[PDB]
Design a protein around this ligand. Structure first.
Ligand SMILES: *[C@@H]1O[C@H](CO)[C@@H](O)[C@H](O)[C@H]1NC(C)=O
Ligand SMILES: *[C@@H]1O[C@H](CO)[C@@H](O)[C@H](O)[C@H]1NC(C)=O
Ligand SMILES: [Zn+2]
Lengths: 206, 211, 362, 331
């Protein structure tokens, strides 16, 4: 069985640069080397046919191949697999995630107290949205009455947007109805590259 | 106008049998091959096999040799994928891709069929609306199983500025949230509707957002 | 750099790989226009082949389509009708049937191989080499025999009192009355043009009237010295073998060499439209179709693998080189090649039917 | 028994025997194959009567190909399906309601004879059929008496530069001109002849049905006073054409009821032979007044030939008729 190995698995290009993603093979597979682009929530799309949009080009030919993008666009964010179509069983590469550079954008923080429909049904969850920011590195800390809390916090992240090229994140603070009414102040602070002071968004249930 | 539409997501207990459909359109069915690709949630692409369409000659891989079977129905232009004796490792998304010239590249893929293989009770989701120049609202979908859930804003009217976040597993119960950023001149002057649909429970819930 | 797609219908996947490499080396030979290779293999039935031309080849805007044969002889027809609907040039690589030289049916068809009828060009040259001025032409009464008769008589009148013609319906086994009329016409040199099955019937009846012996010279083509016809062929017969006529890789890399040259010649002209993008919803022809066909037929490629490549008014290949085979002792022996304009003398002995010897003298 | 009818939107048409009527304006190779194959599977059709609204001659090429693969008798009734060019494949059952090139030239010669148009020039391209057209009217003039002085034929090439077509076109020195080429080539030849002052009323251009084609689509490059012999006679209504086509098939079906004792069932499917077909009993059919018999080549024996002239109002005017008693009846 042929093992496809493409390195690196992560690249960060600038809008307008020239990207070159390499794909290596253990055995010689002639030109039967296809390319696929899998975006954020879609199925993979066939890019090139037999190692050869008008911005994607293919070169290389036996064991060493390459996928070139002469001008990267913000819609090029996604995964890129190279498939062996020369011998059975058909095998794919490890993939290479293509992130893109951008201008630093401050996140838009918005905290939401537990809803009445949930408090009237037991349990309380405090959600905190941090949307449209760059870069993706960001720290979020929950504080209840000035005390930092890490227990019972669920975080999820979005992939880089194909049009905005920014990232978004939601942080939910799950407690019990007894523990929620036990306190008063609930803050959702965050420190990012675009912040001289930690961005804080809070609410008082009183 | 070439399209490959697969069947909906499935939920099955370990040891059952699933049958996934894949209907074609826009091209002569018997001139191509039909491949099947499996993809685990975090993992990447794994090729399961391929079945010739003109001659119903399947070609399974070594890993997928035993329990997987490729069916065909040329009269309705549809290929099938049947899996017997399900394990916990069969939980993945299964694509059907058209084989160009029977054994060539995969030039057209389906939307994918998400398969969940576990032994847990399926629970309908709970929806709680989040209320606070630009105003951002929220919608919380809090305990549910299995994974496939579709959340839309205003039945598709609000499609710009929607951030639906991936769910988190929490003892056989998923939970996600969705945000919608709207101008201050479109709320509360305009109505905002959160649509939540769960195909496994066959349930749909709509919760509005009032100050 | 704009994309110019070239279509192909080939036999196996290995031949498609050679097609992509031929296009690949064509881009190395000079820049502003990049060629791309699009190809499929043959389909089970002609309907599915015709639909595959629309869905897989025309849908990718191919300027031309190369067509070769499937493994194990009128298979180019579905490609000819479908792509000829839009006046897309179809280049045949293997087929040699004379029906593809009729532009009333296959207007947009070319060939890197000559039809079976153009073997009369070599027959005419030997009539000049040996100063033969009276020959007997026995052809079958089909589309293949008519063309060999017309091509030969055209070369003679262009300096039909130099040749007599006798025809027979294909599939006939009783050629007794036919050859008897040939013997009664002071026959010496007989030129036969029939299929491998029909030639076998002529050879069997030839041994009945003792026309296999020492008083006759048999001049044939390629089908009449292949298979069962070769088993019953009279000793000392002289047939032809098309050099490289069966390779399919030589004719792939040569057709691409000609198409690449003609594409660059095309884009040196003004007012050029792109080929149709798919069949559905398109009923008008490719506006540049007729022009590009005229550019292809006017193309001259002398550095070809199969020799000089030029096309006649019907798209059939010119300057094709043949092998003059002479059956002696149940084995075909090449006594010379058809250079393409002349007959190059090979220092081997021609053994006439009967046992005596001569050579391709002077 | 079960017959299908496919037509276009032209001539304003809206709808034992089991007729299946449909109308679509897509006539590409894939659309032609799809319609007939989807008609064959889902409806055991024993015959097809087709017509379209285009001048694409290759539609008749596709219908002949489909008829030899599906074993379905197809009758070209109107448009490119009725344009005669390629000979019908012997293993097919595709016939068209049109005339051959030799049948039109006899009418073209009859026009010139009755108006004493003895002196004429010949202008053809390398388009297929030109050597047939030259050879027929040359032997008919050389031995039989319809032309007296025929200038040497002028060969053209519309694909070449205008300067090439212009230099060759000025060699004409006759009042009557026989112009044989495609309708696409005729738009270019007659637009350039106008620049040379060769399309005035002191000249008479006579063109076969390959140039006129549809009596419904008239290009502006056609000069006023263009004389042509066509078989899309607008008085031969499209309603009557399908009645003649159905009559040929139903007669061929009843005539195939006894020689064989059955009607060939439609093929299973185009996508993955008969002992008797309706090939015979169909080339020799008389219906109503005239006989609709065909030839082995595909075209009609007694076609609805007609002589038309292009009025100054960009319209065709019927000023002749040949279908009666093998004679030309001018008005
Ligand atoms: C020519 O053809 C023969 C058989 O047809 C093949 O074995 C040979 O490799 C070919 N030579 C080439 C392509 O140079
Ligand atoms: C054929 O012979 C002539 C002269 O003998 C020569 O000019 C020509 O090059 C030869 N053909 C080839 C293909 O070499
Ligand atoms: Zn009409």
């Amino acid at each position: 069985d042929i093992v496809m190995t493409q390195a690196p698995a992560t690249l960060s290009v600038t809008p307008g640069d020239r990207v070159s993603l390499s794909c290596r093979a253990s055995q010689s597979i002639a030109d039967y080397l296809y390319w696929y682009q899998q975006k954020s929530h879609e199925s993979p799309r066939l890019l090139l046919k037999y190692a050869s949009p008008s911005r994607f080009s293919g070169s290389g030919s036996g064991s060493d191949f390459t996928l070139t993008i002469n001008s990267v666009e913000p819609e090029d964010v996604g995964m890129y697999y190279c498939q062996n179509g020369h011998s059975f069983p058909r095998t794919f590469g490890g993939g290479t995630k293509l992130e893109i550079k951008r201008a630093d954008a401050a996140p838009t923080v918005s905290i939401f107290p537990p809803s009445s429909e949930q408090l009237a049904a037991g349990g309380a969850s405090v959600v905190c949205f941090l949307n449209n920011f760059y870069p993706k590195d960001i720290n979020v800390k929950w504080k209840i009455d000035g005390s930092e809390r890490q227990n019972g916090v669920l975080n999820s992240w979005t992939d880089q947007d194909s049009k905005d090229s920014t990232y978004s994140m939601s942080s939910t603070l799950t407690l019990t109805k007894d523990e929620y009414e036990r306190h008063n102040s609930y803050t959702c602070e965050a420190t990012h590259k675009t912040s001289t002071s930690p961005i804080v968004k809070s609410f008082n249930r009183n | 106008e070439v399209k490959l539409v697969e069947s909906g997501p499935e939920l099955k207990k370990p040891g059952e049998t699933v049958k996934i459909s894949c209907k074609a359109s826009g091209f002569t069915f018997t001139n191509y091959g039909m491949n099947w690709v499996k993809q685990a949630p975090g993992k990447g692409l794994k090729w399961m096999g391929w079945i010739n369409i003109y001659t119903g000659e399947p070609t399974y891989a070594d890993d997928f040799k035993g329990r997987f079977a490729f069916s065909l129905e040329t009269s309705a232009s549809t290929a099938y994928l049947q899996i017997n004796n399900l394990k916990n490792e069969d939980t993945a998304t299964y694509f059907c891709a058209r084989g160009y010239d029977y054994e060539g590249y995969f030039d057209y893929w389906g939307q994918g069929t998400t398969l969940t293989v576990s032994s847990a009770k399926t629970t309908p989701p709970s929806v709680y609306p989040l209320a606070p120049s630009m105003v951002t609202l929220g919608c919380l979908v809090k305990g549910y199983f299995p994974e496939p859930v579709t959340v839309t804003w205003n039945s598709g009217s609000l499609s710009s500025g929607v951030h639906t976040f991936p769910a988190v597993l929490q003892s056989d119960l998923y939970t996600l949230s969705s945000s919608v950023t709207v101008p201050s001149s479109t709320w509360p002057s305009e109505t905002v509707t959160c649509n939540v649909a769960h195909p496994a429970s066959s349930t749909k819930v709509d919760k509005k957002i009032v100050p | 750099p704009k994309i110019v797609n070239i279509g192909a219908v080939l036999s196996t996947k290995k031949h498609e790989q050679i097609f992509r490499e031929a296009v690949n080396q064509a881009n190395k030979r000079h820049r502003k226009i990049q060629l791309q290779a699009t190809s499929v293999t043959h389909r089970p039935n002609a309907i599915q082949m015709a639909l595959s031309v629309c869905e897989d080849l025309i849908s990718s805007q191919v300027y031309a389509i190369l067509v070769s044969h499937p493994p194990a002889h009128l298979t180019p027809t579905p490609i000819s009708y479908t792509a000829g609907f839009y006046r897309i040039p179809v280049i045949g690589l293997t087929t040699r049937m004379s029906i593809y030289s009729d532009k009333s049916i296959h207007l947009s068809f070319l060939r890197t191989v000559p039809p079976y009828s153009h073997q009369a060009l070599v027959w005419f040259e030997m009539m000049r080499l040996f100063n033969w001025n009276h020959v007997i032409l026995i052809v079958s009464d089909d589309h293949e025999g008519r063309a060999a008769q017309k091509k030969l008589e055209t070369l003679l009148e262009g300096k039909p009192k130099a040749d007599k013609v006798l025809q027979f319906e294909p599939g006939t086994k009783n050629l007794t009355a036919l050859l008897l009329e040939a013997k009664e016409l002071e026959a010496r040199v007989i030129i036969l043009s029939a299929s491998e099955d029909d030639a076998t019937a002529v050879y069997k009846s030839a041994a009945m009237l003792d026309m296999t012996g020492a008083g006759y010279v048999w001049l044939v083509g390629e089908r009449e010295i292949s298979g069962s016809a070769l088993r019953y062929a009279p000793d000392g017969i002289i047939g032809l073998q098309l050099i490289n006529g069966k390779n399919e890789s030589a004719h792939i890399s040569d057709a691409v060499a000609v198409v690449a040259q003609a594409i660059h010649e095309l884009f040196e002209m003004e007012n050029i439209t792109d080929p149709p993008r798919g069949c559905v919803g398109n009923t008008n022809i490719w506006k540049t179709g007729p022009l590009f066909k005229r550019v292809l037929m006017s193309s001259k490629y002398p550095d070809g693998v199969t020799g000089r490549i030029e096309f006649n008014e019907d798209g059939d290949r010119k300057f094709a080189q043949y092998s003059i085979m002479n059956l002696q002792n149940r084995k075909l022996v090449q006594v010379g090649i058809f250079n393409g304009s002349y007959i190059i003398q090979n220092d081997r002995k021609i053994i006439w039917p009967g046992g005596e010897t001569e050579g391709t003298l002077v | 028994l079960n017959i299908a009818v496919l037509l276009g939107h032209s001539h304003d048409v809206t709808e034992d025997v089991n007729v299946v009527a449909l109308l679509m304006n897509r006539t590409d190779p894939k659309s032609l194959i799809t319609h007939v194959c989807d008609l064959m599977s889902g409806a055991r059709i024993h015959g097809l009567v087709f017509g379209d609204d285009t001048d694409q001659e290759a539609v008749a090429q596709m219908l002949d190909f489909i008829s030899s693969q599906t074993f379905i008798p197809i009758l070209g009734i109107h448009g490119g399906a009725s344009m005669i060019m390629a000979d019908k494949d012997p293993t097919s059952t595709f016939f068209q309601f049109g005339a051959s090139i030799q049948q039109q030239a006899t009418v073209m010669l009859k026009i010139m004879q009755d108006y004493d148009w003895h002196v004429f020039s010949l202008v053809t391209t390398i388009f297929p059929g030109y050597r047939d057209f030259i050879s027929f009217i040359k032997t008919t003039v050389d031995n039989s008496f319809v032309g007296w002085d025929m200038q040497n034929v002028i060969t053209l090439d519309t694909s070449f530069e205008d300067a090439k077509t212009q230099v060759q076109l000025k060699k004409i020195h006759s009042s009557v001109i026989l112009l044989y080429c495609s309708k696409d080539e005729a738009v270019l030849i007659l637009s350039e002849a106008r620049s040379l002052g060769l399309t005035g009323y002191d000249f008479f251009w006579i063109v076969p049905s390959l140039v006129s084609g549809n009596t419904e689509l008239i290009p502006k490059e056609f000069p006023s006073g263009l004389i042509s012999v066509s078989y899309d006679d607008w008085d031969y209504s499209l309603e009557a054409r399908v009645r003649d086509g159905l009559g040929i098939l139903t007669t061929a079906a009843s005539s195939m009821l006894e020689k064989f004792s059955y009607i060939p069932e439609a093929k299973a499917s185009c996508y993955g032979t008969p002992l008797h077909t309706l090939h015979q009993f169909m080339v020799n059919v008389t219906w109503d007044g005239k006989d609709l018999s065909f030839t082995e080549e595909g075209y009609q024996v007694h076609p609805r030939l007609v002589v038309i002239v292009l009025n100054k109002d960009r319209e065709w005017e019927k000023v002749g008729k040949w279908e009666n008693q093998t004679l030309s009846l001018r008005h």
